Amino acid sequence: SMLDDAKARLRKYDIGGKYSHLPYNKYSVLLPLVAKEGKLHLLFTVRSEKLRRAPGEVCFPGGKRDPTDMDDAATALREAQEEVGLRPHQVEVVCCLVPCLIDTDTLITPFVGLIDHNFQAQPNPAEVKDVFLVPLAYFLHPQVHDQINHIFEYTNPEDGVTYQIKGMTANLAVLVAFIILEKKPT
Numbered sequence: 741s742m743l744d745d746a747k748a749r750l751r752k753y754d755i756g757g758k759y760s761h762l763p764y765n766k767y768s769v770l771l772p773l774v775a776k777e778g779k780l781h782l783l784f785t786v787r788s789e790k791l792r793r794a795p796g797e798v799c800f801p802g803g804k805r806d807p808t809d810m811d812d813a814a815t816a817l818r819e820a821q822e823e824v825g826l827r828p829h830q831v832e833v834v835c836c837l838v839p840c841l842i843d844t845d846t847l848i849t850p851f852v853g854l855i856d857h858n859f860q861a862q863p864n865p866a867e868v869k870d871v872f873l874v875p876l877a878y879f880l881h882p883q884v885h886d887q888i889n890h891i892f893e894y895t896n897p898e899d900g901v902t903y904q905i906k907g908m909t910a911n912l913a914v915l916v917a918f919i920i921l922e923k924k925p926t
């Protein structure tokens with residue numbers, strides 16, 4: 741099936757806990773896969789304009805590890821619950837992708853999660869201004885604008901709203917699309 745095939749692909753890129761004990765400032769993100777209309781989508785947040793770091797930017801759910809977290813995957817799930825109301829029973833964490841090193845002292849660990857079809861986002865307005873889906877296949881043929889560095893523009897055909905996706909967020913989205921969608925019979 742579509743979902744069994746996605747999970748099988750993802751598991752081949754799982755790094756596991758290999759890098760997890762290293763003494764960094766630690767953050768985790770959840771790359772949430774949603775199946776709608778017979779295709780996979782990624783769920784993105786738009787950060788509240790209130791926040792000091794990157795107000796109004798497109799981001800995956802996530803944040804800083806805290807002492808309660810059993811592991812890095814727990815960080816991602818705790819933060820996702822706080823930001824969009826995603827409960828742990830509503831997500832299957834499939835793998836841990838390559839971590840992202842930033843600022844010389846920080847390590848961001850991305851986890852891919854399969855999201856239950858009955859989940860409905862409840863954006864927490866203190867943290868998130870908006871939540872939206874993008875079809876995973878978009879990231880194979882994105883609309884690129886050079887700002888100099890590359891920026892994706894995605895227009896939601898439901899409402900005509902355009903979102904800008906860039907940086908680590910854009911890079912991770914492409915990675916997930918390659919892993920899941922490369923070399924598939926039609």
Ligand SMILES: Cc1cccc(CC(=O)Nc2ccon2)c1
Pocket residue numbers: 767768769785786787788799800801802803823867868908909
């Ligand atoms: C890609 C990336 C980079 C930095 C931090 C995060 C986690 C995060 O803060 N997600 C939030 C917060 C509010 O809405 N989404 C993710």
